[PDB]
């Protein structure tokens, strides 16, 4: 992968579903990425991080971030986890149950969208198309931000726009990262 510097205000995406089973899904994510580099050949990914693996999701997300933290939305969570919502930091505990402990076959990426529509596609959209065609699920979780380690906003009511994820939003249910 080509890289670009990490500054605040990029998008956080997760590529995958929610040996053996993990071997199929793998073939898709790395496929989509390649396709992406083809479909949109301009270096927008800052901070791909798998490592070390297999490791609990929040730990994966730990090595993704050099500065500040992330803020992600509850509507843009995977429908499997989103469904277990439908009660305050009482639900902080649950969303920790789904997004803290479980170990991922997934790839976490941070892409930067700067102007420059290529062909028809945007960054998020060329990753949209390269992902679908590659037969790969992708969730755009939230954006990269100066404050806090991990910040969820209550998105469940009205969803946020594909595009409007960079605004300020004032979270509840904030989660510190791990150590090293």
């Amino acid at each position: 992968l080509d890289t670009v510097r990490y500054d605040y205000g990029h998008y956080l995406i997760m590529l995958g579903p929610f040996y053996a089973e993990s071997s199929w899904a793998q073939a898709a994510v790395q496929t989509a990425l390649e396709l992406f580099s083809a479909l949109y050949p301009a270096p927008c990914i800052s901070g791909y991080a798998r490592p070390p693996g297999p490791s609990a999701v929040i730990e994966h997300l730990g090595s993704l971030v050099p500065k500040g933290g992330l803020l992600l939305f509850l509507s843009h969570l995977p429908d499997d986890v989103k469904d277990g919502l439908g009660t305050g930091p009482g639900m902080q505990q649950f969303v920790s149950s789904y997004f803290l402990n479980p170990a991922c076959s997934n790839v976490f990426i941070t892409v930067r969208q700067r102007g420059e529509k290529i062909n028809g596609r945007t960054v998020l959209q060329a990753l949209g198309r390269a992902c679908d065609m590659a037969g790969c699920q992708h969730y755009v979780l939230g954006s990269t931000v100066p404050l806090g380690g991990l910040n969820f906003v209550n998105d469940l009511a009205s969803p946020v726009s594909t595009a409007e994820m960079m605004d300020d939003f004032s979270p509840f249910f904030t989660v510190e990262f791990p150590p090293i």
């Binding site: 050099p66 960079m166 300020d168 004032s170």
Partner: protein
């Protein structure tokens, strides 16, 4: 669409203003440059204003109403009484436009006795004032940390932007740590003695 061609020249002009705003933000100033009304700082502020009103021009040019991405904007809802239409009158503290919308105890008591009177509650001055105090401190604090939050969101520039908390130089070089413990000592000493200075000064009354 020949006009749609013109609106992007305004957009990249925006891009240009931000180029020169960062070029000025870097420019460094000695003391005599710091007495200057034409200094790189004040130039940078003239440029920031000319930018924001170009942006406003442009906003009212696309019908899109002028505002950008701040926690100030969202109305902050409050039901902290057990009584929802006291929270009707109270929840619009904020309906008042922009910054400077922030009450004192008197305002909250006027709105809670407003919702007490015209809705006709009829409860003693006792628990009425418990509701007014509980609410005032509650939303006082919520509002405060909402403002603070907006601060740590958008603070400084691209220079302050790149900051890791744990590359702090004081960590590897304890001589520096020594010096800084010293300065913080001094700092708190001074703060407290100036506050108490004007206390025991205003005692002259």
């Amino acid at each position: 669409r020949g006009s749609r061609r013109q609106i992007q020249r305004l957009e990249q002009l925006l891009a240009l203003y931000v180029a020169e705003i960062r070029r000025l933000q870097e420019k460094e100033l000695d003391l005599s440059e710091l007495d200057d009304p034409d200094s790189a700082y004040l130039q940078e502020a003239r440029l920031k204003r000319k930018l924001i009103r170009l942006f406003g021009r442009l906003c009212e040019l696309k019908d899109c109403s002028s505002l950008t991405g701040r926690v100030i904007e969202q109305r902050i809802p409050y039901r902290g009484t057990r009584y929802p239409e006291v929270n009707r009158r109270i929840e619009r503290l904020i309906n008042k436009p922009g910054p400077d919308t922030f009450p004192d105890y008197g305002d909250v008591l006027r709105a809670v006795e407003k919702a007490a009177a015209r809705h006709s509650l009829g409860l003693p001055r006792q628990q009425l004032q418990l509701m007014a105090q509980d609410a005032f401190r509650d939303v006082g604090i919520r509002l405060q940390e909402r403002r603070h939050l907006d601060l740590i969101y958008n603070f400084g520039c691209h220079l302050t932007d790149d900051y890791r908390p744990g590359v702090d130089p004081a960590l590897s070089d304890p001589v520096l740590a020594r010096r800084l413990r010293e300065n913080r000592s001094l700092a708190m000493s001074r703060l407290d003695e100036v506050i108490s200075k004007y206390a025991m000064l205003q005692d002259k009354s």
